[PDB]
């Protein structure tokens, strides 16, 4: 059934406070969807740059959805409350979600869907490879790019005017 979706806007996800979010609220906004972790070598560069992008582009319509996951080196061990508190240290004002799995049979259906999209395909299969993979989503909820763990968020900035 998640296979039949054609837009991110068809999904819902539980935010970091335990409340459901209809992802259709991102309709008309360019969105970055990313899997985060607090204990990765690139935690700092990723959070800092995402906060910076959000601050500078939120008025142009940039939204950021951050999904914690503990699937990559067990680098997100904390509770949702502890992760929320960690994000607060970076002055995060974008949208934090409850911890999920992004690979395997229990992965969040959004993540299952993103990974098989025409412009969401991975390199070396479609599995998320490590923390801080980023998906760029257009104003219609279509996946338009996948950026790998090594591609810092500021790499995405040049692509934003292609979809604003």
């Amino acid at each position: 059934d998640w296979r039949a979706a054609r837009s991110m806007h068809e999904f819902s996800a539980k935010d970091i406070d335990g409340h459901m979010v209809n992802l259709d609220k991102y309709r008309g906004f360019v969105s970055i969807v990313t899997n985060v972790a607090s204990q990765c070598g690139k935690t700092e560069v990723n959070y800092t740059q995402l906060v910076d992008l959000h601050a500078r582009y939120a008025e142009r319509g940039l939204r950021i959805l951050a999904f914690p996951s503990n699937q990559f080196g067990k680098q997100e061990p904390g509770s949702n409350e502890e992760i929320k508190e960690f994000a607060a240290g970076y002055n995060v004002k974008f949208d934090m979600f409850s911890k999920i799995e992004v690979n395997g049979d229990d992965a969040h259906p959004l993540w299952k869907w993103m990974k098989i999209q025409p412009k969401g395909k991975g390199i070396l299969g479609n599995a998320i490879k490590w923390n801080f993979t980023k998906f760029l989503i257009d104003k219609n909820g279509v996946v338009v790019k996948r950026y790998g763990p090594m591609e810092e968020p500021l790499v995405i900035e040049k692509d934003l005017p292609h979809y604003f």
């Binding site: 070598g41 070396l124 299969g125 490879k129 996948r146 763990p149």
Partner: peptide, 14 residues
């Protein structure tokens, strides 16, 4: 430069 995630990941793909 050596891959900074070794040995947990070897920078293969995305």
């Amino acid at each position: 430069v050596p891959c900074p995630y070794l040995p947990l990941w070897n920078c293969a793909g995305k």
